[PDB]
């Protein structure tokens, strides 16, 4: 209702309200998380808690990125009405980390500060490529964005190998590297199995041997490694199991993913991701990843609907909640992977269905190539010049009395 | 040599300054930011001084024509044209306000993987 | 360059056939060999480069398909494109160019290339 | 840079020389280092002269 008079109803458009990006910002103890809720439960149907289409399911979909939980309690309507709610604890969600791969956890496998990386990544490639085309005939790369899955144990094998293996150089034999008893190796096929013993280098012809490529450079390296391979804060990313009891995923169990983000496992309308759990400066290990997931699956269906003339069926809505902590505006390279999945959605998703919902508190911290692309603004309290300055140089209207009335607002 | 440009901007503060300040001809409608009055105001050739303020409270259909070719600054009505652009786009709350549908995850994922890829 | 079979390059155009496979460098006077002057400048760079050359959705520009289906496309149908894009061929006069399904980081160059042609 | 480096690897090389019982440690964890032996480590590098008579090791 209009707060001047409260006989006076309020409403708006909903074709271009919720069909574009939209920006929640305010200031501390000013009723916004209140008001998401109240948004986001007049979208679904919950009137004083109860579910109004009892009787018929609707076609609505929503997901949500917490980082402070706060949004649960918001939906946990009584059991008689009829209304499941998908909630998701990352930190128990067990989420593979070879379908992608790229920026997520290799950028932390073969390198993790340092320029070395340059003769990090030179025979790794090759011996991944040989374990995914020994399992299938294809073709992979150090980066590769095909859902496929590789026993990361046995590749590194090879990797533990490099800095415990000792190439041969007898003179009159083929530069094959020498075991410990003297056999050749003809292939480094059998590396990644199991690593292998080999013969100390030396000079004398009897026994010449030269240190390998990567022997000895990298061994704290593979140490951290081998830590998070055991480590106690990152079960989730399957890493702690390394090919163990829950393993049973070959090359067809890809759907289950994308049914459980979506939420098409038990009929549910709103999705919640909770990611406070995870520890921090590996959050965005996962976002590159369950942005990346949506955006695959809504543009390859919207592709298979114009051969007969229609349209995408299922739209989709994403609400961030804090922004400004894995999308800064000053910011160095902890933060790539997630900044070019947001702009992809915030540049081409209205041509296959997909919106964005951002929410902050501190606007002069985000980006501005993601918060110029907004249409409709609700403002509520502010009380920082700074953030009026960078509200007021953004707005579509810019008129002095209309900027006069932020801080004056109950 | 033969050559024009027609430059159509919604934000003129954010386009470049070298190619948008040789424009002779303008046509201006309804603008509700001050930068963008301003630049406009200080990239105009013309001698218009209080007819440049009528621009936040332009209607629908009204456009202000200043340049070379006009005698004088004016505010001209302009009628529809026929056809008439249009966009397609999804409308979210229409589909969002029908029943359950399913899509077909089965030929989504053929598509997906066409021997890898 | 040494190779395995220890032949050597009689001239460097070679490289534009294969991926040769070389010897491993020694002190040695057996087999005394050196790294080249450029052996680990590009490592990443050859992994983009097999990243860009895949891509389906970088199609049009002709990276992708060693294919015979276009591999004829010489320097004899340049005259096609142009009048292509100058609305020649079946004569008309307004040609309206549509860049709604490119990628926004190759946005740029196609009208670069088209203005400059 | 240069003088950075050095001391990264002699403070390495030295970090477990004699210390196991840190199964696993690159840099950071707090364990005790002499850091005259790395002094002495890098000044012999400054004054490292490499022996190059045939017939002899290249040390």
Not at chain 1, 168 to 196: A, C, D, H, M, T
Not at chain 2, 49 to 73: F, K, M, N
Request: proline share 4%; glycine share 4%; with cysteine.
């Amino acid at each position: 209702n209009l707060a001047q008079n409260e006989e006076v109803s309020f409403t708006l458009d909903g074709d271009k309200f919720f069909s574009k990006h939209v920006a929640v910002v305010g200031s501390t103890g000013s009723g916004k998380s209140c008001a998401v809720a109240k948004i986001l439960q007049n979208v679904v149907g919950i009137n004083d808690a109860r579910n109004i289409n009892k009787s018929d399911k609707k076609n609505s979909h929503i997901i949500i990125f917490d980082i402070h939980s706060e949004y649960k309690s918001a939906f946990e309507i009584d059991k008689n009405e009829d209304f499941n709610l998908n909630y998701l604890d990352v930190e128990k969600l067990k989420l593979p980390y070879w379908l992608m791969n790229s920026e997520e956890l290799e950028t932390l496998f073969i390198e993790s500060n340092e320029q070395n990386s340059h003769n990090q990544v030179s025979q790794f490639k090759r011996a991944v490529v040989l374990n995914k085309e020994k399992y299938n005939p294809e073709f992979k790369k150090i980066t590769y964005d095909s859902p496929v899955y590789f026993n990361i144990n046995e590749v590194f094998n090879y990797i533990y190998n490099l800095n415990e293996e000792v190439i041969n150089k007898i003179e009159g034999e083929p530069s094959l590297p020498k075991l410990s008893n003297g056999e050749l190796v003809e292939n480094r096929q059998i590396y990644f199995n199991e690593k292998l013993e080999f013969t100390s280098s030396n000079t004398s012809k009897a026994t010449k041997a030269s240190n390998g490529p990567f022997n000895g450079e990298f061994n704290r390296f593979l140490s951290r490694f081998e830590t998070k391979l055991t480590d106690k804060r990152l079960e989730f990313l399957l890493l702690n199991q390394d090919v163990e009891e829950n393993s049973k995923y070959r090359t067809e169990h890809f759907e289950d993913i994308l049914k459980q983000f979506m939420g098409y496992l038990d009929r549910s309308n709103v999705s919640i991701i909770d990611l406070s759990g995870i520890p921090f400066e590996v959050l965005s290990i996962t976002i590159s990843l369950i942005s990346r997931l949506i955006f695959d699956f809504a543009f390859h269906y919207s592709k298979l609907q114009h051969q007969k003339d229609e349209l995408n069926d299922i739209p989709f809505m994403i609400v961030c909640e804090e922004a400004h902590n894995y999308i800064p505006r000053t910011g160095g390279i902890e933060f790539k992977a997630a900044k070019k999945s947001i702009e992809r959605i915030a540049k081409e998703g209205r041509k296959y269905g997909l919106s964005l919902m951002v929410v902050s508190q501190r606007p002069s911290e985000v980006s501005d190539t993601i918060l110029s692309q907004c249409n409709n603004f609700i403002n509520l309290r502010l009380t920082n010049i700074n953030d009026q300055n960078y509200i007021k140089n953004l707005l579509p209207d810019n008129s002095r009395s209309i900027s006069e009335i932020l801080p004056t607002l109950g | 040599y033969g050559l024009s440009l027609m430059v159509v901007s919604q934000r003129p503060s954010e386009v470049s300054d070298t190619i948008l300040s040789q424009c002779n001809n303008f046509i201006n409608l309804r603008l509700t930011n001050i930068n963008d009055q301003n630049y406009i105001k200080n990239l105009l050739p013309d001698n218009s001084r209080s007819i440049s303020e009528i621009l936040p409270t332009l209607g629908a259909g009204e456009c202000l024509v200043v340049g070379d070719s006009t005698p004088i600054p004016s505010i001209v009505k302009l009628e529809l044209p026929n056809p008439e652009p249009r966009s397609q786009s999804i409308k979210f709350h229409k589909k969002w306000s029908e029943s359950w549908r399913t899509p077909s995850f089965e030929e989504v994922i053929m598509r997906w993987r066409k021997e890898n890829g």
